[PDB]
Amino acid sequence: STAGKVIKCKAAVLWEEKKPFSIEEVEVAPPKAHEVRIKMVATGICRSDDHVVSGTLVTPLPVIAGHEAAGIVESIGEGVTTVRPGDKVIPLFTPQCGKCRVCKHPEGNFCLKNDLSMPRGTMQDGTSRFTCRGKPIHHFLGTSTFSQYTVVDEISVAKIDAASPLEKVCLIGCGFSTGYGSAVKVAKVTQGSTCAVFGLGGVGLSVIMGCKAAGAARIIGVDINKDKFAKAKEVGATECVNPQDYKKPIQEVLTEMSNGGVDFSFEVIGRLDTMVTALSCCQEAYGVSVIVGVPPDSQNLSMNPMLLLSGRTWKGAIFGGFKSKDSVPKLVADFMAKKFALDPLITHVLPFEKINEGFDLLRSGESIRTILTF
Amino acid sequence: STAGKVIKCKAAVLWEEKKPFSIEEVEVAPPKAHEVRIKMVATGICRSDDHVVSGTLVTPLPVIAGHEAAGIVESIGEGVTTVRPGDKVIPLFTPQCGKCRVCKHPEGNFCLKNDLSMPRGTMQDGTSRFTCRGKPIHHFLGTSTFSQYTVVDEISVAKIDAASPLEKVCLIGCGFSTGYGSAVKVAKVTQGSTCAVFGLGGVGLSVIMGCKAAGAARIIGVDINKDKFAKAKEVGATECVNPQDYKKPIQEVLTEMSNGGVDFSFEVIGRLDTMVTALSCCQEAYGVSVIVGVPPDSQNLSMNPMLLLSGRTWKGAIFGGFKSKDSVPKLVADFMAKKFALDPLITHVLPFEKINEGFDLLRSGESIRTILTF
Numbered sequence: 197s198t199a200g201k202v203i204k205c206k207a208a209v210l211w212e213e214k215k216p217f218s219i220e221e222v223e224v225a226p227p228k229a230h231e232v233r234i235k236m237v238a239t240g241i242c243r244s245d246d247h248v249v250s251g252t253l254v255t256p257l258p259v260i261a262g263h264e265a266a267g268i269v270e271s272i273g274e275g276v277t278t279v280r281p282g283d284k285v286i287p288l289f290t291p292q293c294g295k296c297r298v299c300k301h302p303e304g305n306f307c308l309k310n311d312l313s314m315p316r317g318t319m320q321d322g323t324s325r326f327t328c329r330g331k332p333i334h335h336f337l338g339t340s341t342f343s344q345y346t347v348v349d350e351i352s353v354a355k356i357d358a359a360s361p362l363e364k365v366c367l368i369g370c371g372f373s374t375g376y377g378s379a380v381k382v383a384k385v386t387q388g389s390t391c392a393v394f395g396l397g398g399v400g401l402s403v404i405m406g407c408k409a410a411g412a413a414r415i416i417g418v419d420i421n422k423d424k425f426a427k428a429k430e431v432g433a434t435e436c437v438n439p440q441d442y443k444k445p446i447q448e449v450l451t452e453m454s455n456g457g458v459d460f461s462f463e464v465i466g467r468l469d470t471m472v473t474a475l476s477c478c479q480e481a482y483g484v485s486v487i488v489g490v491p492p493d494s495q496n497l498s499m500n501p502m503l504l505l506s507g508r509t510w511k512g513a514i515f516g517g518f519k520s521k522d523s524v525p526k527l528v529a530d531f532m533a534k535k536f537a538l539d540p541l542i543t544h545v546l547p548f549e550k551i552n553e554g555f556d557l558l559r560s561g562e563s564i565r566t567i568l569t570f
Numbered sequence: 571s572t573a574g575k576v577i578k579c580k581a582a583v584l585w586e587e588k589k590p591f592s593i594e595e596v597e598v599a600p601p602k603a604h605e606v607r608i609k610m611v612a613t614g615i616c617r618s619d620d621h622v623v624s625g626t627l628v629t630p631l632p633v634i635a636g637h638e639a640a641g642i643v644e645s646i647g648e649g650v651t652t653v654r655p656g657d658k659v660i661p662l663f664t665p666q667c668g669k670c671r672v673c674k675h676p677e678g679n680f681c682l683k684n685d686l687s688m689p690r691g692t693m694q695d696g697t698s699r700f701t702c703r704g705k706p707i708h709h710f711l712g713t714s715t716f717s718q719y720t721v722v723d724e725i726s727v728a729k730i731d732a733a734s735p736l737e738k739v740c741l742i743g744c745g746f747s748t749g750y751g752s753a754v755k756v757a758k759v760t761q762g763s764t765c766a767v768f769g770l771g772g773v774g775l776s777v778i779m780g781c782k783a784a785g786a787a788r789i790i791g792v793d794i795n796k797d798k799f800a801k802a803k804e805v806g807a808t809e810c811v812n813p814q815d816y817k818k819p820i821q822e823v824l825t826e827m828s829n830g831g832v833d834f835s836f837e838v839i840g841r842l843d844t845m846v847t848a849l850s851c852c853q854e855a856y857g858v859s860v861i862v863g864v865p866p867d868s869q870n871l872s873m874n875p876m877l878l879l880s881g882r883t884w885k886g887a888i889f890g891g892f893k894s895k896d897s898v899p900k901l902v903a904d905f906m907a908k909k910f911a912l913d914p915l916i917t918h919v920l921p922f923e924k925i926n927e928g929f930d931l932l933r934s935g936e937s938i939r940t941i942l943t944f
């Protein structure tokens with residue numbers, strides 16, 4: 197029916213930064229060779245989407261953001277093998293071409309075909325598949341999930357369990373997988389250890405989930421929003437700290453609390469200052485600190501190199517270290533097998549048209565994850 | 571004979587920074603319980619000793635510097651069970667009390683009894699065993715090897731093979747073990763990988779030895795002093811680069827010649843800029859950079875945290891990551907079994923009286939490691 201035809205549908209377009217998303221009627225071109233058109237079912241609102249609006253994260257505008265979602269394959273372009281119409285799929289913002297040096301490496305997951313380092317806002321052939329009022333609109337991370345339909349590259353999609361709850365498993369497109377793997381895969385949190393997690397939003401709580409599943413003996417959640425505490429305890433935190441309650445720095449407090457420093461700390465906010473503090477918090481001779489938060493564009497932090505010379509380790513990771521195509525489908529199965537829970541991350545469900553309301557809840561600090569249903 | 575009595579001997583005293591060492595007569599008190607008095611046989615000139623002179627490295631003055639050496643036990647205090655008079659020993663600038671958290675940790679080596687973080691320049695009891703011109707002189711890292719005799723705590727001394735050439739194994743006291751351990755133990759260089767080593771002095775060449783030992787396929791030596799290249803090629807470097815020969819920044823040059831970045835890079839100079847540069851030139855998704863050089867006191871570096879977010883790992887280490895008391899004797903044995911060569915690092919051998927000429931050879935870039943003999 198729609199196959200081979202330009203679809204006219206609704207999409208939330210961001211024309212200028214610091215503006216609300218305007219639901220517009222856009223024309224989604226049919227998938228070219230090796231591309232896949234997807235009908236969106238559920239998409240989550242991640243902080244990185246808000247960074248685009250805030251101007252924190254620079255990307256070509258106008259653009260259709262959205263990168264955490266799950267849908268159904270409508271049509272596939274010429275050459276597509278991995279999926280076919282009717283398939284349930286999760287678009288992957290970190291592709292997996294399986295051909296570059298990174299994809300061929302045992303532990304790298306930052307595929308060279310990504311559109312993150314230097315965003316272009318186009319398809320692999322450098323063109324867009326979205327038009328609004330005769331004006332081409334940019335893609336976002338090769339995903340652009342804030343649209344009833346979207347076109348992604350074959351390398352940027354994973355087929356998932358046909359029986360999976362699309363309205364929940366969408367969290368596996370970013371938030372969950374990022375948090376879980378940051379603790380489990382990047383930091384490789386050990387049993388009995390003490391962990392510190394700065395930022396208790398969807399991604400942070402998923403970090404706590406990873407730490408808890410890794411058998412962490414102590415998991416101290418850190419946030420300036422106390423209303424996050426109860427939910428944090430719920431998913432694993434053993435204690436929660438609000439930096440506003442003290443007269444001394446949180447690094448001093450956390451070091452005193454942990455008797456010399458934590459074993460693993462995670463920065464899940466996106467602030468330069470909290471990135472340094474998370475480093476300082478870990479034990480000087482063997483602590484490990486992982487940056488999960490996305491920093492403001494072009495900002496450089498300053499730190500004393502002696503923090504590392506004593507023995508600390510500092511690393512970062514996109515998508516929790518998971519090779520997208522390989523991991524997403526297996527992560528979904530683990531969900532179907534009740535190996536972990538996504539339910540505590542979802543605080544609100546709203547229809548797609550109410551996206552702006554969904555971003556205000558996040559900015560207000562009233563929600564963890566809001567899922568948008570089409 | 572001299573046991574239980576003060577000893578009058580010569581030692582190189584640094585009264586004020588940026589001044590030459592004064593070879594003078596000092597009185598070395600007898601060892602107290604759990605202390606050991608050593609007759610120095612050989613001591614190498616490490617750049618960290620030069621940092622004390624320059625004021626780059628802050629420690630209480632006046633002081634008797636020196637930390638890379640080998641000697642013989644003259645007498646032991648009460649309770650000393652690990653060594654005995656006549657034993658060949660290597661003083662350890664990084665101790666191993668074996669009781670603290672770090673000591674108990676399987677990975678940590680930065681013993682909490684160290685005198686590196688908050689240098690107070692005394693013995694573990696708060697006192698000094700040195701007197702010069704009637705005044706008490708400070709110890710340095712609990713070692714102070716630029717003296718014919720010295721007293722160190724038992725947790726700061728390791729008994730070595732009685733047949734070892736002290737004029738050589740002294741390098742295991744710092745330069746060699748640090749360079750070699752950084753590659754082998756800290757970075758954990760993989761077989762077939764590409765490494766870049768910044769700084770080709772005594773410790774840097776030891777990193778090259780460790781990289782070659784771990785099985786690195788390509789080891790690029792980076793130094794502004796082309797006179798070091800030959801010796802570097804001699805110990806393992808496959809190519810040597812001099813930033814001066816290029817019209818383009820070194821990180822681009824290295825990235826281009828490595829086809830997107832090295833797997834492992836090491837900063838073995840002690841500069842804020844080369845530390846960030848070394849980080850930059852390692853592959854963004856899986857590269858690891860190890861800081862080995864000592865930075866100037868109280869100086870912060872500036873960097874973009876996005877360098878870490880893509881997946882890079884940054885770490886630093888003291889004494890090559892080795893738990894000191896456990897490792898040094900094994901390192902000496904391996905040397906005895908011809909597992910590695912120290913000869914290539916020794917360019918000059920001078921008697922203790924020519925310490926100042928020794929520091930000039932280093933500053934001039936004329937020597938790699940100069941060993942002073944007593």
Ligand SMILES: NC(=O)c1ccc[n+]([C@@H]2O[C@H](COP(=O)([O-])OP(=O)(O)OC[C@H]3O[C@@H](n4cnc5c(N)ncnc54)[C@H](O)[C@@H]3O)[C@@H](O)[C@H]2O)c1
Pocket residue numbers: 242243244245247370371374394395396397398399400418419420421424439464465466467470487488489490491513514515516558561564
């Ligand atoms: N590395 C990746 O692949 C990846 C993936 C997903 C999200 N992110 C980034 O992770 C960060 C968090 O995303 P989220 O979706 O969980 O966000 P969120 O907005 O739900 O949560 C951020 C949390 O940090 C707290 N916070 C803010 N400032 C704080 C401070 N100064 N001190 C202590 N706590 C503070 C907030 O109250 C909030 O609870 C964002 O920067 C996002 O862009 C990165």
Ligand SMILES: NC(=O)c1ccc[n+]([C@@H]2O[C@H](COP(=O)([O-])OP(=O)(O)OC[C@H]3O[C@@H](n4cnc5c(N)ncnc54)[C@H](O)[C@@H]3O)[C@@H](O)[C@H]2O)c1
Pocket residue numbers: 616617618621744745748768769770771772773774792793794795798838839840841844861862863864865887888889890932935938
């Ligand atoms: N972490 C530890 O445990 C430990 C142990 C020993 C030494 N160190 C430190 O390691 C560093 C090296 O010590 P070393 O004894 O081998 O010193 P070294 O003086 O022999 O110096 C190494 C090299 O750095 C080179 N260099 C200087 N500036 C350069 C630049 N801008 N670019 C490229 N090359 C440059 C010099 O030409 C020299 O060849 C020092 O900072 C020292 O204090 C640390």
Ligand SMILES: *OC(*)(*)(*)(*)C1(*)(*)(*)=C(*)(*)(*)(F(*)*)C(*)(*)(*)(*)(F(*)*)=C(*)(*)(F*)C(*)(*)(F*)=C1(*)(*)(*)F*
Pocket residue numbers: 616618619627637663686711744864888889
């Ligand atoms: O070379 C080892 C070394 C020293 F001696 C110091 F004094 C110091 F502070 C360091 F950090 C070192 F690595």
Ligand SMILES: *OC(*)(*)(*)(*)C1(*)(*)(*)=C(*)(*)(*)(F(*)*)C(*)(*)(*)(F(*)(*)*)=C(*)(*)(F(*)*)[C@](*)(F*)=C1(*)(*)(*)F*
Pocket residue numbers: 242244245253263289312337370490514515
């Ligand atoms: O949430 C993941 C994420 C994004 F969407 C971005 F746009 C980005 F640049 C990141 F670095 C992210 F981690």
Ligand SMILES: [Zn+2]
Pocket residue numbers: 242243244245263264370371
């Ligand atoms: Zn996200």
Ligand SMILES: [Zn+2]
Pocket residue numbers: 291292293294295296297298299300307308309
């Ligand atoms: Zn790839």
Ligand SMILES: [Zn+2]
Pocket residue numbers: 616617618619637638744745
């Ligand atoms: Zn040294």
Ligand SMILES: [Zn+2]
Pocket residue numbers: 665666667668669670671672673681682683
């Ligand atoms: Zn100890």
